[PDB]
Design a protein around this nucleic acid. Structure first.
Ligand code: ADP
Ligand code: ADP
Ligand code: ALF
Ligand code: ALF
Ligand code: MG
Ligand code: MG
Lengths: 448, 448, 448
DNA sequence: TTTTTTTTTTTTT
């Protein structure tokens, strides 16, 4: 008979210390819960202690015994004599933290044993469940265990700890001779004048109108980053297939249009320049592309965690686009769904320390204004995106709106929202034929 | 005693198929390994088969017996008589992939049981390991479990692999289609591109609103399967009488107006088409339909077993529909009744190894959404249905909800869940006059 | 035989505590009387204790024993040995108030039982009284019960009591010679001219668009509170990691540009400023920051109570922001969830007597208007927010919406709700480089 | 466990 491991002496010491000192109750309340006690009468005792403390009543022997007696639970836990014995057996509450740690350890061990027994029972008797069902159930149980055993600190942090961590980060950055561009370098020096590269755990939003090269600019950034860094990056282009964009990926590098790439022409003078550029992409092995239209945030998070654990973190996550992901729970309201999606993306970016660039559509009210320059009040699914994003940029081409204009080729990236950084406008040189965004080497006008 | 789960019959069928058909060995070796067999003599047999295949020796009864006798492993695996019994017990090697998948599933479940036993042992015996150490050990074990089956084909992978696949696809598709079929034909090659044919023992659920032609589409699938196979087809029409179903089938096959057939106002050419369709159906004589209302799953299972025994198996089962079956034991709880019905249908499909398509109904709240394209949550009692079903497809028609829709005559079959293929939308052409679904020959819209 | 409810152990604890500590006698006198004791000897003992305390005699073993011997009640209460037993039975008198509450509850229940017995006796023997007479008698008894058991407030308070409390408050304020910020000082002279400091138990809501510096202004307020008081402050940064918040605080206090700090391009003077700021902050050591996401109000309340207990109260609570908190009980209704969150926050603020500033987001409809200066309706789910809040301040920046605005670097803090003050707009100077808010040192503009 | 009426507040276009 395998009795589950436990420490009843630790339980009695915890209860007696609570009877002697309620001020450490939060120290007991932070570590263990009512169900953490191995013995059900001890669970009832701790529940009644929590009820007395939440009422503001001091926790002693007599009050707890009377509170249990009013509920008919005094005799169920052993009577007044058992509670007096438990109070007597505890000499001091000074080391009650170690006893609570032991109780929490025993509770975690028993929970692990129970989950393992459930997994074994489901394995011996599948009961109609297939391979996928059993694997998903096991992974869900393990995720519950891991999330229960990750919730340890989850509370206030003193200034001294926060100041030490922040100054450690500051000294780490100071010792690094990065020479500017601390984040993942975008490959655009003018962009790095404001953005200083794609900082990790940042929710960068490239929100642009359709047929503005929004996906083109995002993939230009992705390709430039892959040229610069070798950290594994991630792409989720739900809208367009990876087959098309790869040609565009070979269009920026060759600095030409696709045209013959989409068709079946063979022109191997600059086509031969591409045949060999791909090899440069071959040796990198740091881009993971999966269109997978109709994605949920859970699946995206699972894929991201998989790739990060496989190849040591993620260089850059790419999402195309925000208005394509499906959340079954909040499918009723689109704005709530977008809020949940953006929250999940921000949480994943903070978890894996990776910049996330996601594309967003806009509203038609932008073009209805006299000023067709996109601002923070023009985004489709308005509130949630502006609330949750860290960096927000707008692609503005005056040539699209006004064909007779001086900004032909000049793609204005309006930084509309940046918490850590000055908002503004960065001029570029978008090659509309070549589908290649480049830097603006012309006369940079003053932003009024 | 909790005996570990295993499938000895699947192992025997795999070994006999490898003895008879060596060319499917690469099919078998992709799915199972030597250690996947629960029985150690089967592990030795698979190891010797792998050794003979790597050495170029043919894998038959005599060569395997001689090779096992050379290593002294003939007596360890049961002997020449046992090997001959293994060869004899396998009627055909065509379905060896399903047996190998079953053996792989049993190996995965036993590995999960072993890992759970290790976890329980570490819980009962910490052996110096702290909570962090046990947490890391459990996470490492579940990481190995995930690494046992981690996407593989579903995996996006780094730039190199997807790049060499995609540029090869482009350089092949520059002017040449070169379709690879890759699936059992169900009358829709575009559908068979994703579904890869009607997978046996799978629970396929097609869901639509009433008047969306769900029964019409199911009948078209049944007709295509019947014209593309010799195995008999079984239909359950609880919603409609069998004569109306026959009229729908004749109208779909002969491409005549349903109204003219129903009213009898048919010309000589329509009569000739009807006579030809009747001749084809009387040539087949494999269509068997039951229209009894309120049928229990027990009666359906008994009749299906009767038909399979009388005809050496059934190609396809049709049920119309899920919500019309009756369970007297669960008449009080509708959701539990639906769950038990779906479980019984899945068990029957696994037992008789026949695809079963049962129609389903949606909820009204789907019409309350801005997007009326169905999802998994729109099903009535969707919780059990989504888990039990393998291939879930929805029928959507924007032309129904929009009079000025440009997609008139176009129906969207949205695969929402597929365990063995990609999800997504396939467009088809609908003839309401003929009540027929056919391949969409219009421009191929790039789904986002 | 149903015994009337009592707690003899609690009574003995009370008697022994009164023998040991007479200073809590008033605490005993507030809750219980002599007739509240179940046993007549205990009633006599409490009567003798009351007589001794009224006469000024100490309530100990010897004096009480002598008084009971002089009145001849020493033998009736158990004798000197029993009195010494009662004295010995009490280890501590600190929890004597809860024991008195227990005895009070027992007395109330016994009185209820006695009155119910009287009513049943009058029912079985009407004795000429009509149904009206018996109803009047029963209602009179229930009125007597409700009057006797609820004398300790629990209802409408008398005018005179509120008048005395209010005049005590006014005299307290008059005696205080600070003549200034009654509440926690904001660090801004013109703001404190209208707010008189951040008053305790007040709900303050700061509303602005994202990237307007609302969190920056809240951090500046936190810095001012920390520099102007020794009480600890509490910060909830659910939007940003605590490292970024600390970097913002360092940039604001040290007046160094955030770009150089983030990029690490800091000179010797900037490093000296940062080091001095760190020294001052570590001298203070009164900031506690939590950046956990999805926090329920229960966890926030528990942590706030813990910090207040550990540090003798909390000066200020900061929440960033309202819409990032999660309540599982009202996850389906966002508006009800926001209402319950705001209600719980106001309850906590009144409980701990601490100003709580929780940030909020604006709807974009205000940007649809010609005037973009915020109103009360522009907040998200503002219906409960405006009611529950004590102070509401909007942050407006015309320079954001107008490139040629003359108010560059100027922010309008529009007090839109103030229960004890006028509404109106106060101008402040904003340093985007240092991300700091300061008193506006330009010319004063008349508010029309 | 399921859907169904019905009111109410919020946000979106
Ligand atoms: N002669 C016809 N011409 C055009 N449309 C037709 C004709 N006959 C039937 N249809 C359409 O075919 C659809 C089939 O849907 P239906 O069979 O009613 O769904 P269910 O299977 O739930 O009964 C109907 O919506 C109907 O409008
Ligand atoms: N280095 C810098 N130079 C100039 N302005 C900056 C710099 N860094 C940040 N800012 C400004 O500070 C603001 C921060 O606003 P923020 O505190 O995020 O508002 P909220 O907290 O309401 O979202 C941004 O709008 C940005 O324009
Ligand atoms: F009305 Al039907 F299938 F014919 F739902
Ligand atoms: F981006 Al914020 F409060 F910092 F909305
Ligand atoms: Mg039908
Ligand atoms: Mg902020």
């Amino acid at each position: 008979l395998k009795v589950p491991p436990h420490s009843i002496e630790a339980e009695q010491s915890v209860l007696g210390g609570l009877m002697l000192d309620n001020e450490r109750w939060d120290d007991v309340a932070e570590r263990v819960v009512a169900d953490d006690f191995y013995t059900r009468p001890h669970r009832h005792i701790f529940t009644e202690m929590a009820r007395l403390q939440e009422s503001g009543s001091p926790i002693d022997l007599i009050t707890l015994a009377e509170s249990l007696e009013r509920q008919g639970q005094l005799d169920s836990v052993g009577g007044f004599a058992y509670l007096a014995e438990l109070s007597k057996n505890t000499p001091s509450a000074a080391n009650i933290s170690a006893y609570a740690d032991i109780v929490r350890e025993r509770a975690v061990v028993r929970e692990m044993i129970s989950v393992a027994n459930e997994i074994a029972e489901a394995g011996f008797d599948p009961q109609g469940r297939t391979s996928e069902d059993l694997l998903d159930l096991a992974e869900s149980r393990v995720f519950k265990i891991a999330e229960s055993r990750a919730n340890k600190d989850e509370g206030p942090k003193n200034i001294a700890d926060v100041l030490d961590a922040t100054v450690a980060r500051i000294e780490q950055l100071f010792q690094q001779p990065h020479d500017g561009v601390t984040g993942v370098n975008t490959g655009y020096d003018d962009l790095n004048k404001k953005t200083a590269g794609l900082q990790p755990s940042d929710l960068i939003i490239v929100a642009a109108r359709p047929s503005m090269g929004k996906t083109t600019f995002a993939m230009n950034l992705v390709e430039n980053a892959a040229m610069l860094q070798d950290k594994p990056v991630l792409i989720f282009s739900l809208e367009m297939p990876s087959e098309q964009i790869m040609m565009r990926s070979l269009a920026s590098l060759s600095r030409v249009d696709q045209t013959k790439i989409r068709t079946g022409q063979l022109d191997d003078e600059d086509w031969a320049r591409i045949s060999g550029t791909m090899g440069i992409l071959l040796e990198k092995r740091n881009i993971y592309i999966d269109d997978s239209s109709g994605l949920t945030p859970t699946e995206v998070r699972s894929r991201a965690r998989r790739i990060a654990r496989e190849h040591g973190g993620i260089g850059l996550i790419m999402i195309d686009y925000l208005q394509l992901m499906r959340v079954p729970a909040l499918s009723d309201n689109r704005t709530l769904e977008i809020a949940e999606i953006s929250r999940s993306l921000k949480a994943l970016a903070k978890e894996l320390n990776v910049p996330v660039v996601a594309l967003s559509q806009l509203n038609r009210s932008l073009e209805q204004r006299a000023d067709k320059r996109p601002v923070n009040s023009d985004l489709r699914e308005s509130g949630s995106i502006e609330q949750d994003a860290d960096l927000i940029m707008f692609i503005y081409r005056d040539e699209v709106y006004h064909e007779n204009s001086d900004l032909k080729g000049i793609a204005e990236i309006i930084i509309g929202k940046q918490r850590n950084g000055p908002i503004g406008t960065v001029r570029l040189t978008f090659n509309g034929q070549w589908s290649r965004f480049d830097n603006y080497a012309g006369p940079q006008y003053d932003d009024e």
